[PDB]
Design an enzyme around this catalytic site. Structure first.
Site, PDB file in Angstrom:
ATOM      1  N   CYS A  35     -89.736  28.573   2.211  1.00 61.49           N
ATOM      2  CA  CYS A  35     -90.088  27.176   1.998  1.00 61.49           C
ATOM      3  C   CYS A  35     -89.873  26.900   0.511  1.00 61.49           C
ATOM      4  O   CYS A  35     -90.800  26.580  -0.233  1.00 61.49           O
ATOM      5  CB  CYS A  35     -91.532  26.881   2.461  1.00 61.49           C
ATOM      6  SG  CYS A  35     -92.853  27.646   1.473  1.00 61.49           S
ATOM      7  N   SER A  56    -100.070  28.190   5.191  1.00 56.67           N
ATOM      8  CA  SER A  56    -100.341  29.516   5.780  1.00 56.67           C
ATOM      9  C   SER A  56    -101.709  30.067   5.403  1.00 56.67           C
ATOM     10  O   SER A  56    -102.212  30.945   6.088  1.00 56.67           O
ATOM     11  CB  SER A  56     -99.240  30.518   5.433  1.00 56.67           C
ATOM     12  OG  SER A  56     -98.095  30.272   6.227  1.00 56.67           O
TER      13      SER A  56
HETATM   14  N1  FCO Z   1     -93.783  25.485   4.678  1.00 60.01           N
HETATM   15  C1  FCO Z   1     -94.174  26.262   3.908  1.00 60.01           C
HETATM   16 FE1  FCO Z   1     -94.805  27.521   2.644  1.00 60.01          FE
HETATM   17  C2  FCO Z   1     -96.300  27.972   3.684  1.00 60.01           C
HETATM   18  N2  FCO Z   1     -97.188  28.241   4.333  1.00 60.01           N
HETATM   19  C3  FCO Z   1     -95.657  26.248   1.825  1.00 60.01           C
HETATM   20  O1  FCO Z   1     -96.201  25.407   1.295  1.00 60.01           O
HETATM   21 NI    NI Z   2     -93.262  29.617   2.420  1.00 60.36          NI
END
Ligand code: FCO
Ligand code: NI
Ligand code: SF4
Ligand code: SF4
Ligand code: F3S
Ligand SMILES: [Mg+2]
Lengths: 544, 260
Positions: A70, A494
């Site tokens: 990401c 996350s």
């Molecule tokens: N999509 C992503 Fe990374 C994660 N969890 C971030 O912010």
């Molecule tokens: Ni990520």
């Protein structure tokens, strides 16, 4: 019925592969079903500690390295965060460019996740060798638009290439795959395996194009370099030729989403209907994304085209507004010093203290973010329920299309199948909006190419940057003192989804989702992977 | 038989893996089907847990030997326990894999030199691979490096042999030249035509970014020559170079928006 062994005992899966970062999952199994679970993140880096005392302008460059999957999203969150702390309102063009780069990131991220991270939990690649290519072609002709890559010739070519690879005995990334030699939990007919595998290889190429589109505006991928305090630096990204190329590439990627991604997702989901009753949670949170007004965090929350909100207890009738003051993080079950519970991110503390592997009292480098005492699931499923509940036209259309195709009620979406579907759902919606968003910035940039606003570094301040990244609600929080970073805290999707238990001992969304998982074979626990991967874990993100 | 490649992930953001799969000569599918045997790679491998760990051991025990790619720095505090895979400290598994490797390729500034987690005050006591293991490595730095540079070096090492390295272990093929020496804004630099801010007309006209902190003049990389994703690079996108392919750049190139 769902294949289920009689196994009673523990199962540890470390490493969890096909995710970003280092995750260890522990579960207790009884009579072939998970009865208890632990999400144990295995790496600490400490970007929040490293940032202390540094120039606030530098933060976005350090935080972007929180994650290269990401990529961009942390540079975006930090920039919004510092922009708020110095009280600068970015120019319209900068809002547009920043949002389009986020849109491009959703496209790249979601494609790679479905095919290259998640698909191998549902698709038996070696079974694809047993498929009749001609039969596979006609099947693909019925469930998806006509395309040369779905012809018998093209599918046979894939099968032959795959056949030569397997016959070499060097299985590479397929070595010890859970599906080798058959596995009761893998349901797909061979023709579907072949179709999915052909697209898996096509998608490896398509993700390059997606990344190229993103780099036109981003400067490069991975790790963009076009954002600055007060807006963006990429004046070329407003010009005619680059944006013509950006649209062209984006349409190629969008064609692949609509021709391959959605139809494979629908095909897979129809075979694994039983997964619409496994892996559900109850609380959803989103900061929203793609706002028309990004002049402040509250304007972001109110004007995001993918709306913000909070759903509790699966009640699709009461979407509350996000209360930024209600967010906090606990450390009771984490590898941090005691006395760090219930910290709001502006008062965040990051004082690492490791105990030992599999210590039930401290088992993760992730903190436990909570909202008014409750764990919150974030990400595509969260955004989907919230947008659906608010009656967002695009989300209404595409979700009903999916619910129809699978012939399930909206309540079935509270599951691992639903979590997987929602990722595809919003990808299609992002695609549907690309040409509009591009035209907007193309017209705007042609008229006036203002891209960065003037600002001044305050002696003392605080600010927050919000974004809904491909995995969910992201926030960066800064305290500035003596024009330097006094505290900088990241609370990442996350962290919400895969962190450990909170101070009350309540399970995180992944830990709760795993309860009730059937295990067909303890030695090849693909079902654990299915649910875990559906959350699209990012551990470098979660821990930072 | 295709040459075996073992790829380890230590203290990293996975940006280097992502960079690698942006290769187009060849594409990643062609690379792993026709040119190498990628025998362990946590981001994309099918096996998980014990099965994955068994896959690693099978590769490390392979009769034909293997090349080692390392992504990420090594966290060494508390016996290396702040970074673990399958219950083992990363430093331990990397040490073991490096011992019989035919060669060691460090993809990224993290594995090469320590990277973002090594930046002050370095709470995990993170180290680059060469320092932690005490052996020479082929370094492909950048945050992340160009896939052209990584795949280029892999191919070279498999076919021709070890490419000529500079004092910092970087292949001269890709890192022999300063970014600045190949920058299209060089005439502006020579003419003392600098943007004083990102909102200035100077910036709109594409003036040199030196006064805004560009570390191009002290950075060895091929970014302006080869570009990224076949379309762009930071200065072309109007932003100064951070010096991301230089050792310890997090502490030697900051503040990023100044030359101080
Ligand atoms: N999509 C992503 Fe990374 C994660 N969890 C971030 O912010
Ligand atoms: Ni990520
Ligand atoms: S070198 Fe940069 S891109 Fe590569 S793993 Fe390290 S932080 Fe990530
Ligand atoms: S923009 Fe940077 S790399 Fe280019 S001429 Fe100026 S100082 Fe050199
Ligand atoms: S930041 Fe890194 S990618 Fe190239 S332009 Fe500078 S060396
Ligand atoms: Mg944090």
């Amino acid at each position: 019925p769902t294949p289920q062994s009689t196994f009673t005992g523990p199962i540890v899966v470390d490493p969890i592969t096909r995710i970003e970062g280092h995750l260890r999952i522990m579960v207790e199994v009884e009579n072939g079903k998970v009865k208890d679970a632990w999400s144990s993140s295995q790496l600490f880096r400490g970007l929040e500690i490293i940032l202390k005392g540094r120039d606030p302008r530098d933060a976005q460059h350090f935080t972007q390295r929180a994650c290269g999957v990401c990529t961009y999203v942390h540079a975006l969150a930090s920039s919004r965060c510092v922009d708020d702390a110095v009280k600068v309102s970015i120019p319209a063009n900068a809002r547009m460019m920043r949002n389009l780069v986020m849109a491009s990131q959703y496209l790249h991220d979601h494609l790679v996740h479905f095919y290259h991270l998640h698909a191998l939990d549902w698709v038996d690649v070696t079974a694809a060798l047993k498929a009749d290519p001609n039969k596979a072609a006609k099947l693909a002709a019925s469930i998806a638009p006509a395309r040369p890559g779905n012809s018998a010739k093209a599918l046979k070519a894939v099968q032959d290439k795959l056949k030569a690879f397997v016959e070499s005995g060097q299985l590479g990334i397929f070595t010890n795959a859970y599906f080798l030699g058959g596995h009761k939990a893998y349901y797909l007919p061979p023709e579907v395996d072949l179709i999915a595998t052909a697209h898996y290889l096509e998608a490896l190429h398509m993700q390059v194009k997606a990344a190229s589109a993103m780099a036109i505006l981003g400067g490069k991928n991975p790790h963009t370099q076009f954002t600055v305090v007060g807006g963006c630096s990429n004046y070329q990204g407003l010009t005619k030729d680059p944006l013509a190329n950006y649209l062209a590439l984006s349409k190629e990627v969008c064609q692949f989403v609509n021709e391959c991604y959605i139809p494979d997702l629908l095909a897979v989901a129809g075979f694994y209907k039983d997964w619409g009753g496994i892996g559900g949670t109850s609380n959803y949170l989103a900061f929203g994304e793609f706002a028309t007004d990004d002049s402040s965090p509250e304007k972001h929350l109110a004007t995001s085209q993918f709306p913000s909100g909070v759903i509790t207890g699966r009640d699709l009738g009461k979407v509350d507004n996000v209360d930024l003051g209600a967010i906090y993080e606990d450390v009771k079950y984490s590898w941090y010093a005691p006395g760090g519970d219930g910290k709001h991110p502006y008062d965040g503390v990051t004082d690492p203290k490791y105990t030992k592997l599999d210590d039930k009292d401290h088992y993760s480098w992730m903190k436990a973010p909570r909202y008014k005492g409750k764990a919150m699931e974030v990400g595509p499923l969260a955004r989907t329920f919230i947008a659906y509940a608010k009656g967002q036209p695009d989300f209404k259309k595409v979700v009903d299309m999916v619910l129809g195709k699978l012939s399930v009620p909206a309540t079935a979406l509270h599951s691992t199948l639903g979590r997987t579907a929602a990722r595809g759902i919003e990808t299609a919606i992002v695609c549907a909006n690309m040409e509009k968003w591009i035209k907007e910035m193309a017209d705007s940039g042609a008229k006036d190419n203002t891209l960065c606003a003037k600002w001044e570094m305050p002696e003392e301040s605080k600010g927050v940057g919000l974004a809904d990244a491909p995995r969910g609600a992201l926030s960066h929080w800064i305290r500035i003192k003596g024009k330097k970073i006094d505290n900088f805290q990241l609370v990442v999707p996350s962290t919400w989804n895969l962190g450990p238990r909170g101070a009350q001992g309540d399970k995180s969304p992944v830990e709760e989702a795993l309860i009730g998982t059937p295990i067909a074979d303890p030695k090849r626990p693909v079902e654990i992977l299915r649910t875990v991967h559906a959350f699209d874990p990012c551990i470098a993100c979660g821990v930072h | 038989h295709r040459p075996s490649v073992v790829w380890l992930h230590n203290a990293e953001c996975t940006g280097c893996t992502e960079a690698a799969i942006r290769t187009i000569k060849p594409y990643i599918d062609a690379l792993i089907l026709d040119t190498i045997s990628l025998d362990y790679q946590e981001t994309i491998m099918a096996a998980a847990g014990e099965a994955a760990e068994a896959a690693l051991h099978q590769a490390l025990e392979g009769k034909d030997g293997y090349y080692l790619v390392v992504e990420g720095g090594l966290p060494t505090i508390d016996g290396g326990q702040w970074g673990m895979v399958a219950g083992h400290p990363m430093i331990e598994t990397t040490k073991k894999a490096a011992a019989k490797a035919k060669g060691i390729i460090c993809i990224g500034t993290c594995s090469a030199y320590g990277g973002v987690q090594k930046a002050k005050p370095n709470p995990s006591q993170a180290k680059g691979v060469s320092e932690a293991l005490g052996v020479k490595t082929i370094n492909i730095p950048g945050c992340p490096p160009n896939p052209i540079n990584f795949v280029g070096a892999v191919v070279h090492v498999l076919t021709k042999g070890i490419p000529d390295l500079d004092e910092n272990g970087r292949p001269k093929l890709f890192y022999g030249e300063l970014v600045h020496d190949n920058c299209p804004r060089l005439p502006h630099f020579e003419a003392s035509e600098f943007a004083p801010s990102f909102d200035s007309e100077e910036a709109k006209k594409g003036f040199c970014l030196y006064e805004l902190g560009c570390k191009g003049p002290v950075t060895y990389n091929n970014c302006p020559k080869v570009l990224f994703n076949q379309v762009n690079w930071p200065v072309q996108a109007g932003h100064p170079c951070l010096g991301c392919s230089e050792p310890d750049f997090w502490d030697t190139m900051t503040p990023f928006y100044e030359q101080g």
